[PDB]
Design a protein around this nucleic acid. Sequence first.
RNA 1: GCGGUGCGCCGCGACCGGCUCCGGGACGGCUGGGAAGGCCCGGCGGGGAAGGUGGCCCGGGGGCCCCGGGUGUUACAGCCCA
RNA 2: UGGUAAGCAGAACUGGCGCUGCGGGAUGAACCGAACGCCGGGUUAAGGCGCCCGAUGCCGACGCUCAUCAGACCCCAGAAAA
RNA 3: GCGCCGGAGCCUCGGUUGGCCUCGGAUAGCCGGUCCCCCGCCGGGGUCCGGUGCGGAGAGCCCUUCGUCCCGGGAAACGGGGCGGCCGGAAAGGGGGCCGCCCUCUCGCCCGUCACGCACCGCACGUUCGUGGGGAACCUGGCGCUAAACCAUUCGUAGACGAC
Lengths: 109, 199, 190, 176, 137, 252
Amino acid sequence: SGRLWCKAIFAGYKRGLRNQREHTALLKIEGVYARDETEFYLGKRCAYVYKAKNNTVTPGGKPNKTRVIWGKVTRAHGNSGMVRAKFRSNLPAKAIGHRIRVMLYPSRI
Amino acid sequence: QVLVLDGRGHLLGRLAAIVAKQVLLGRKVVVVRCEGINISGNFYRNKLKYLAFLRKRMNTNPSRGPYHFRAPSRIFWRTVRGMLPHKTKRGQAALDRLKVFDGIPPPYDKKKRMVVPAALKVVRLKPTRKFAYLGRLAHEVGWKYQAVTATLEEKRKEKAKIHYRKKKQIMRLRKQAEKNVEKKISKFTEVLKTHGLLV
Amino acid sequence: MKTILSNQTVDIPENVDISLKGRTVIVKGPRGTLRRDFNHINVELSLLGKKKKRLRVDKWWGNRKELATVRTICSHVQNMIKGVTLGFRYKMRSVYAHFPINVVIQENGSLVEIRNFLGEKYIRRVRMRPGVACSVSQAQKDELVLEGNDIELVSNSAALIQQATTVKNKDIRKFLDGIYVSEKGTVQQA
Amino acid sequence: TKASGTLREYKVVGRCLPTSKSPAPPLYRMRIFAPNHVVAKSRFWYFVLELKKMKKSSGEIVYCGQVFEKSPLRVKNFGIWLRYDSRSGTHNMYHEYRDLIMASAVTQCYRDMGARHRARAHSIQVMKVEEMAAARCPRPAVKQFHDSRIRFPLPHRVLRRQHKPRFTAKRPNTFF
Amino acid sequence: VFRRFVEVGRVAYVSFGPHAGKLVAIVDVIDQNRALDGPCTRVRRQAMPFKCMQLTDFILKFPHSARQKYVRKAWEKADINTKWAATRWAKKIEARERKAKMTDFDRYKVMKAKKMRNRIIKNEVKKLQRAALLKAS
Amino acid sequence: SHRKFSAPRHGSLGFLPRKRSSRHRGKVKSFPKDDPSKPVHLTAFLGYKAGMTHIVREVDRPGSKVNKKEVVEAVTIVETPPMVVVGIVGYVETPRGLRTFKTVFAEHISDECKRRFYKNWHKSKKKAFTKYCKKWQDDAGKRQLDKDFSSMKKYCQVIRVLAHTQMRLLPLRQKKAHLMEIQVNGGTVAEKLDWARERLEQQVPVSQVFGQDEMIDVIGVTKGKGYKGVTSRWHTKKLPRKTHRGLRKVAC
RNA sequence: GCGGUGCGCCGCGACCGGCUCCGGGACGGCUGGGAAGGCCCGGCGGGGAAGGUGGCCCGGGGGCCCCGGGUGUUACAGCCCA
RNA sequence: UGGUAAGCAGAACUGGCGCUGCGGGAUGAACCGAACGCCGGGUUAAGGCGCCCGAUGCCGACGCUCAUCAGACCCCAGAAAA
RNA sequence: GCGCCGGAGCCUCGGUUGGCCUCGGAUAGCCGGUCCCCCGCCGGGGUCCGGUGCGGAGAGCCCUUCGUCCCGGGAAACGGGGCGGCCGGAAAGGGGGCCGCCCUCUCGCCCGUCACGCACCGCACGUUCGUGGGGAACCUGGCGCUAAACCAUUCGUAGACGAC
């Protein structure tokens, strides 16, 4: 009936000032604003939900237009609740400042 | 989903530095009452700083040159514009989300306006330092519609005062009808206070 | 150093009843109510004792630029106390060499014309500040009188007629002529 | 030296590895205010060399222990005699501080000699730190705290924790 | 205009730091922005800055250099630990900690109460608005 | 190196987009500032330059060497047939500038005023204001037209009156009249709007705007002279005949 | 059934091992055999001064109720030391 | 060493650039860090951590400073006597 | 063959996964409550009481929904759903509030009894905003529209040519 994932923002890639490393993404999870509070979300699965033109098969039932690139919150970033997530396919940078879902279900509570 | 930030008392670059970053994270921001924004240091320094900005024009065709936007909304827009990569297609995707206003145009005059406390003159300046209202700056450097805005601004300062008077009037009825009904919500008040809502 | 505390008491009399609206001190008495706002100055204003016989201005953790903003507030309120009881009368006199300066008084106190200054055809309308009354005393030669409550507005309105009469493109050591502030006093006495 | 963190006061004694003339040279003690024991023994040789014909190689460090606080809960006046290198010549200064701890007051001195005069810990030479009677302290900056019934509010409470909402409804107060 | 003052014996409430949530008594003022003990609330005699302590309306009468034996006396004599707890500040401090420990089932048991406790007051406030309407017309 | 001998700059930069006027009928760029201590009046008119002739008059001024001697001064004739008011327009005051609120045209509009709404009058079926005019001959239409004044004397601040030139009373080739918004400056906004609505479908002569011996502003488009060169346009120095490619151009 | 090899594409859990950044436990060594402090009653005896507690005044805060100054080693608080 | 000096001319010692990417100093042959097969994980240097721009969104510590020409990072890019 | 009002499939743009309908504003001060009282046409004054690390809290509020049913208790009758008007707003106007009523029920909401719904056999983009945004169209109905621009010609207030 309700939402079973937390709001994250694909803010950027793991980048220096003049070099970006696309294989590691930076996830701004809404709610957590320090490394104090980042402890829960480490090792959690995080999905980039997008929809395209051509239909693709879905695990559960009928083929939708909606797709994902799956991920995994690797470890905490910076000092302000930013987190590093490493995706199985390196995210497209059209998704910069768009909604990707930090899930709950590599649960350890 | 939309930030409706108030501009009254906020600092020029401090609010810009926090707006510009939120908008890059795909948060639609509305900064309102930008005449209320003030800039640190005395007025005459900030006057000279913008007069120094006016003097900088493309010598061979000023119409091509730097567009010195004189409205406080567009002095706030341009200071945010400097804190965005406005050449790239992610940084122009940003500015399209930002929506800046002189006064409080509807539909934003009947929405609760948020405050950035990390960009506020009471929080960030000393009470013995000096500041410069963007209303006085813009007007004296060539903004026309301050005395237009300030009279439309004085309409809703009467209209919203009636709304608040009409809302205190309904909260007095709640501080009467929480009390008449105190005996038959007694089960429903305790469990709120065991888990710490009305304590 | 940051001086931990600096205070000075203004002993407000029985005839003058002052109050404070945050830090906007209002001063009423025999000849009008004077208000002045101190939003800028950043001090504690305490009105203590029954019948409120002393105002007390403090300054917690004040440096040298901010300790000098205590006795100014003392003297501001003390001038406010003076002007509310005794008033401010600035008797200013007309100095000339040859041409007698004709000063006629217009618009029930406010506007003051100055004819024939250094033999000039140009009449000079000087309006006084709102709440300052100008008069010319008789059986005299050369005398103006201002009358008011706020010292800020009486001298400001006197400075308007002292700088109305400046001698342009000359040696002002020889051409001494002009309307200058001769005497600083009050209307009625203690 | 680098006046890093809070300085620890070390007692460093030492003497000359023996001559045929003097079989046992005199033991020389010093109050060294150092971040750690390693640089305390380095700063020991600096001053002793300035005073005697006692270098590091023609000498030995005998004891190196931190002289701790004998009253770290009592508020005390401290009078530090300085010798700092300005951009033109050196100057003898007498400065006064107010701390529980001697080493903390010399830490509080190193920041202050940097703050007001832009002198670094290499320029500065702390020659004497003497705990002072409350009536023997000249500066009014430290004297002003010598009132039995001292009483001040915290007038303009500039709130920190500014980025905990980052976006709020209420304008924050400062008359707490 | 000020009510609370940094005076020897004032109970101040430690907001942040390692002693966040404990009461402390101001024994002596060291500096402009640094003070010097809360013997009954498990706070050792220590130097601590003014920034971290939110100073209350409790002064308990003992001298500035007095050792921790004579802080504990004037503390318990004034009876601060029970005088604190009954104040509406201390109550909403330990209402904040209850709402923190609100279990997902406790979140349910309050929500079902929230609804029925507010489903009545929308009815009852509306009936009060006829008491404003009956007098007019 | 520097300018050897100083000269004032040829022409002004205070108009320098020297292009074809974007409007043939000269727009009033700004109307006079008003104070409601005056009566209601039209602030402008719309005339046609007929020609140019002499005068003889006795100069009434102290001091001059031509004190009550006869001056032959040049005068223009502007044929000003009395304009007909066919509408009113409200302008609300916005912080983005000044926005038009609502245009309310009159019941009947003359065929000369109709022509201005068209390009090809001959080819058209002339159907303009056939369904707008119907809001005047039914009581259902009237109340909205009255509510368009009820919701204009309240909201709007600047009120201008739509007038047109009566092209019938001119010796010109053309018939297509010239519309113009004349700002009604004078008393309060309700008094101003209860005035112009009474003046709707009515004649406005020139005596009821302009009085004699009055200084006024003439807003007219300059006479077109086509693609003229820099010595013809900017009035620079001609080069001294020995020049190769031309002597009627700017050197540097 | 027992070994070997592998899944059509898409996924997933598991324990072991390598290397990792952490987090919480718990034990101990040394020191001026830590310095301080806590609790035992400020163990008996002075003496010292002060950022002077009590007692006496001065002006003012009241229908006699408390702060500012001055006194001085004790007093209905405390501080340091011999 | 010559020359008032020079991004000038001429030596010594080493290290560079040339022949060489790389991280930083916005930019730059030489400066600072560090020299390179192709990659994933981790950690650093020199430098930074309002925003562009990864990183202080620490409830960082104590002072200093008002500029009607503010100040702001080796080489390095605006000043003296007074 | 088009405009407003009232079936079923296909194309294609993707982002989103409960909303907060508002005092003004102060900062060495504020917030909310009221008799003696001056005005303004019920407010705004002085007064007095409470809140003040803001609990009439954005550290927040409201709303939170597996569903259905029978049997009882709290709770609602001043309510619940859907028509005609009643009436509120121009700065970038709004979809609200309130009443009469044709009107349908004592269901919603809080406990507890009692029962069942592909119980899809440990597993993914589920869950909404969404009768979304634009794009050709198809059935089937009502109520209403019949224009203009450009060229060509002409002018000469215009003009290199266009434009005007």
